[PDB]
Write a structure and sequence with these properties.
The structure is a homodimer. By secondary structure, chain A is of the alpha/beta class. Chain A folds into 2 domains: about 260 residues, 2-enoyl-CoA Hydratase, Chain A, domain 1, CATH 3.90.226.10; about 300 residues, Alpha-Beta Complex (2-enoyl-CoA Hydratase, Chain A, domain 1). In chain A, about 35% of the residues lie in helices and about 20% in strands. Chain A is built from 20 helices and 24 strands. In chain A, strands 1, 2, 3, 4, 5, 6, 7, 8 and 9 form a 9-stranded mixed beta sheet that branches. The first copy, chain A, has a 7-stranded mixed beta sheet with strand order 12-13-14-18-20-22-24. A two-stranded antiparallel ribbon of chain A has the order 10-11. The N and C termini of chain A lie far apart (about 80 Å). At the A-B interface, helix 5, helix 6, strand 8, helix 8 and helix 9 of A face helix 5, helix 6, strand 8, helix 8 and helix 9 of B. Chains A, B: This is Acetyl-CoA carboxylase.
């Protein structure tokens, strides 16, 4: 404007003004949002901890003469390409000493944030930079697809496959801050975890282009093609945000459950809600309830009823799609994990009408609860996979399904394929898994098939509440009387039991892996048997709290016993 | 009956009569069908080769005192469980000395072919038997889901995950000969490759049970739930068969493209259609054609126009689903490979009406050609994966897409997810891949993203016909003038060029793998560079026919050079 308190930033660098007009944050201004978000993270954890600017560091990354990325400190707007990146080192509640990650973003002001060869090469380099260090890769999408002109396509494939590989290697997440087109749209999906800012579409082809090809003004705005109304209900977008700052915050909160880097232990963050306590909220057979209450607890008038997991720790995702199942992250006495629950209340899936079809009309699909449908089966497999890849979290499924929908429509819609994905996802899981049939839950023959522990004995183990029930068609006692399940538990005591059981398993798993590096070639049965032979004779291998406690007291001692097996060198 | 020429088999073993009443072949009679089918296979290859019964051997498999499977020779109907298996050793055109595989099947006569604990344990054992030997596993599904009674569920999970693992390990295929229910239905999908016999449904829950739950006689027969009209159009069934013998034949023909066992070279089977010849049938820009003609050639009045691949070698699959793309196996001068082509003619997808919805009505979806849709994108990824897993075949994609459908409906239907699967599938491919834009073909920016060679440089390489065209929106010369593609070819000479190029790559790939076993740790760039340094100085590394010819002449010599590197032992 004219004569402002401080130096006008849209003048020193007018680029900042273009971004705003585009309805997005200026790329060089994003680092500041992550700082604000991290700051809020601390304020929520401990509303009294003094914080210093040295708790957050952001160093831009650019290629040197050799094309290798190096941290540099320069003035904004100096980027010679439409792709920018930052290496961030921030101290957080889960990692007081600090954790790191990279942020890659298009510069909407640099040639409408188009994807040119140089940008694609830069994006790929940054992704490999992160993978090499096992560091999370955050992508801020604000582009207009691939660049065009007459006076580039080989780069689109490079980053597509690069992102595909990253998902299986490091934690990948994408925030759609302005608009994502073409390769930009695929990148959002390939990194899987996506947060869409209201009003910023994820599109393949623009509305104008489609209206021309069709020869009629059928579409008004791109939001009809890639707006949250489309992608959020789709499952392409795991969450939505009111603005960029809300997006950044969600990114930061999502990471609070993820290891600092590949293969590091899951970040344990204890809060006021200690593990030692009963579970208040309990389901009723003659009363409707929200599964979320069993998970995070419910706020009542006579007070607050604690659920199975830590208060305020439930972070739900993909909440706009296949509402038949509920998926999110949570904490068990501080232990982070992925949770999957079944929605009991019937879902009213309202499918819009195809704008390009005067014959098409709005339809409302009824989705009974406790019944798998293609969409909820797909979401279940997707959740399982996103928990395992990158996040590397343990998992608990509050299994409570009557079965799959065998009707013609759902059968024609390939429910058998999506159900099989569930099996595939479980076979791949590398962290401890817990299947638990809730108090008023059940698991008929149709559903047991895809959640049985024998699918992956190494990581799966199932438990049934004494008030639950399982069978082929239509007793936890008979179940344990077959070996099909580990044990039968009592809801109110579930939190205490699982906290120690999980803690015990995490400790043993850690020991199993380290051993795998030594000998290299040995059966799991043998690896775990050897480890348990290290426990004092007086330790009860079946006591979760005792086993975990001993292991945690002898980490270094066990360490020597491992590297003490260097005699593993055999010809 | 009474006084028949030979001994009544339905009397010596009445079980044979029950099966027939069930509308399926008697389990102990299947081996005979495979013999008949193999016999026909020989008759089609060489209508003059004398054949002896010793060309086909079938030994039943059962568990001994230790529960280990052993070959035995006993009388039929002696099975103590409702699951039977056979180890088959048969001489075939691709393997004159013989190839092996196992056949597992339910006995529809033994307690309606239900899945009990013993059967599940047997099925799992057989699957592991096959995986251990890297031998194909054929499953003949004829069951009534999991067994029930009052006077088993833990076994359903074991075989589900077992089959899931097998798909990635060995060639898996399933023939639905009588009916597949519950776990039986999932097994069909988990093994992926499925051939459905007309009239035999693949169902989760029976019609009677569903009509009861819904409280109305909505369904007449299970065929409305799992009939070919449902699963074949679904993609769950890759093919259909008129009867069990037709099914067995299709199984046998499918295997003729697959290695005898895991990691063995793909079975080369040359026929009268030698590699050295031009390609007759050529596409026109102003004339409609069937992509299949470019693949297998077309029968005309002035004679027969040869296509790109060997005559009669095209074996199409998943032909009832997402007709927008065409996928099948074929041979190039005898070299087996998976082929994917684009259907130009618009597809008329007619979707039936939901019988359980008086409001539902028959709908007809128009699918423009050369345009990806969720279903055809899914089929493309699925084909790629089925070519790689188990089949371990090389692949050629006659890439010819204008792009993806960015419309609201297709966008809401998650096309972005299925498109990404394509990328994932390519990143995973372990055999040589060839992308070739046909003569009148094109590959816009939307489609190039998911088929670019840089997605997987190790196995992918692209070629463009001099009459084709590629660009971001709307010249092979400029393409090679960027390095984005290997070269530009001429349709008529494509067969000759690809035959040698593929043969050359297969030979080099073989050398790369063997080297990988020696040193173990070394870059591909280095492994291939070292191998090419073994070629005589006068050999032109760019001459495919010369390189392949030299390698094939010095297999043993190269063999010594490999194992001559035993000095790889480094500390």
């Amino acid at each position: 404007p004219i004569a402002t308190p401080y130096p006008v930033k849209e003048w020193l660098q007018p680029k900042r003004y273009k971004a705003h007009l585009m309805g997005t944050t200026y790329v060089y201004d994003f680092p500041e949002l992550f700082r604000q978000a991290s700051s809020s993270q601390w304020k929520n954890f401990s509303a009294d901890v003094k914080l210093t600017d040295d708790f957050f560091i952001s160093n831009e990354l650019i290629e040197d003469e050799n094309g290798e990325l190096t941290e540099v400190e320069r003035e904004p707007g100096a980027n010679a390409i439409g792709m920018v990146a930052f290496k961030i080192t921030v101290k957080t509640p889960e990692y007081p000493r600090g954790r790191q990650f990279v942020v890659v973003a298009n510069d909407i002001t640099f040639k409408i944030g188009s994807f040119g060869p140089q940008e694609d090469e830069f994006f790929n380099k940054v992704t490999e930079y992160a993978r090499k260090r096992g560091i999370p890769r955050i992508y801020l999408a604000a582009n207009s697809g691939a660049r065009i002109g007459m006076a580039c396509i080989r780069g689109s494939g490079l980053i597509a496959g690069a992102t595909s590989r990253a998902y299986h290697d490091i934690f990948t997440i994408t925030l759609v801050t302005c608009r994502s087109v073409g390769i930009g749209a695929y990148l959002v999906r390939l990194g899987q975890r996506a947060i869409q800012v209201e009003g910023q579409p994820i599109i393949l082809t623009g509305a104008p282009a489609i209206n021309k090809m069709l020869g009629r003004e059928v579409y008004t705005s791109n939001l009809q093609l890639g707006g949250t109304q489309i992608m959020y209900n789709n499952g392409v977008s795991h969450l939505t945000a009111v603005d960029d700052l809300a997006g950044v915050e969600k990114i930061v909160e999502w990471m609070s459950y993820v290891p600092a880097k590949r293969n590091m232990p899951v970040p344990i963050l204890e809060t006021k809600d200690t593990w030692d306590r009963p579970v208040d909220f309990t389901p009723t057979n003659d009363e409707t309830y929200d599964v979320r209450w069993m998970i995070e607890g419910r706020e009542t008038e006579s007070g607050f009823e604690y659920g199975l997991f830590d208060k305020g720790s439930f972070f739900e995702t993909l909440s706009g799609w296949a509402k038949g199942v509920v998926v999110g992250r949570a904490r068990l006495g501080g232990i982070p994990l992925g949770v999957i629950g079944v929605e009991t209340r019937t879902v009213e899936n309202l499918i819009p009408a195809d704008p390009a079809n005067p014959n098409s009309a709005e339809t409302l699909i009824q989705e009974p609860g406790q019944v798998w449908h293609p969409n909820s089966a797909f979401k279940t497999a997707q959740a399982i996979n996103d928990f395992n890849n990158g996040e590397q979290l343990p998992m608990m499924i509050l299994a409570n399904w009557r079965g799959f929908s065998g009707g013609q429509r759902d059968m024609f819609n390939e429910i058998l394929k999506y159900g099989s994905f569930i099996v595939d996802a479980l076979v791949d899981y590398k962290q401890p898994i817990i299947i638990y049939i809730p108090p008023t839950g059940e698991l008929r023959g149709g559903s047991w098939v895809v959640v049985d522990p024998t699918i992956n004995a190494d990581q799966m183990e199932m438990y049934a509440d004494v008030n639950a029930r399982a069978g082929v068609l239509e007793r936890s006692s008979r179940m344990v009387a077959k070996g099909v399940i580990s044990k039968e538990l009592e809801w109110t005591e579930a939190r205490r039991f699982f906290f120690w059981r999980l803690r015990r398993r995490l400790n043993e798993e850690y020991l199993i892996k380290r051993l795998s590096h030594q000998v290299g070639e040995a059966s799991r049965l043998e690896k775990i048997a050897r480890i348990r032979s290290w426990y004092p004779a007086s330790v009860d291998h079946e006591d979760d709290r005792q086993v975990a406690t001993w292991i945690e007291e002898n980490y270094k001692t066990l360490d020597d016993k491992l590297k003490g097996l260097k005699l593993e060198s055999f010809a």
